[PDB]
Amino acid sequence: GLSDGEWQQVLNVWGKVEADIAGHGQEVLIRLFTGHPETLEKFDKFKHLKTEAEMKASEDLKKHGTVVLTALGGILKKKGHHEAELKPLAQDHATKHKIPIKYLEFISDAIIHVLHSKHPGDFGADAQGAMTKALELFRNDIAAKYKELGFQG
Numbered sequence: 001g002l003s004d005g006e007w008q009q010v011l012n013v014w015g016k017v018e019a020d021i022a023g024h025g026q027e028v029l030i031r032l033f034t035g036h037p038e039t040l041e042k043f044d045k046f047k048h049l050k051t052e053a054e055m056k057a058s059e060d061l062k063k064h065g066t067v068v069l070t071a072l073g074g075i076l077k078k079k080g081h082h083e084a085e086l087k088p089l090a091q092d093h094a095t096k097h098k099i100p101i102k103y104l105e106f107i108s109d110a111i112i113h114v115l116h117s118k119h120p121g122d123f124g125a126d127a128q129g130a131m132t133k134a135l136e137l138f139r140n141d142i143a144a145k146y147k148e149l150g151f152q153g
């Protein structure tokens with residue numbers, strides 16, 4: 001898992017995100033959808049959005065961005081002792097939404113990208129290292145539940 005020092009870095013960084021969760025949430029989803037258009041098809045809600053400009057102008061998209069980072073923040077705050085919160089999330093993303101673990105990889109990368117874009121020079125080597133590991137742990141725990149359910153993707 002992560003050391004206490006590492007968890008401290010993750011929650012310090014999360015402080016940056018909480019100052020503007022909708023702004024961070026929206027840019028994450030944009031990065032995802034533009035870098036991997038197939039992911040947009042999973043949302044009936046945003047499949048109409050072709051252009052990035054349209055994406056930028058969607059208040060609905062911003063709303064979902066908020067929903068997503070609120071859920072993620074709640075899990076990160078548990079520092080690994082997140083079974084309770086994570087299982088239900090894993091079960092609906094596999095059975096209901098039908099999201100392959102590769103798309104969780106993609107969003108993980110989108111988060112790191114956004115953190116550097118919005119905090120250039122403010123998101124250092126130790127911080128990036130800790131956040132990367134935290135997102136890997138998150139993905140790994142999801143992968144365990146996906147395996148139980150036999151969801152391939």
Ligand code: HEM
Binds near residue numbers: 039044068089092103
């Ligand atoms: C940081 C990773 C993610 C988090 C924390 C997250 C969280 C959530 C939450 C809290 C909801 C609403 C309740 C539910 O239906 O389960 C949701 C809905 C959904 N998620 Fe995710 N999600 C993540 C990644 C993804 C990815 C990568 C995709 C697809 C590329 C995706 C696809 C969807 C869809 C299609 C819905 C239904 C939304 C609607 O139309 O109302 N999720 N997600």
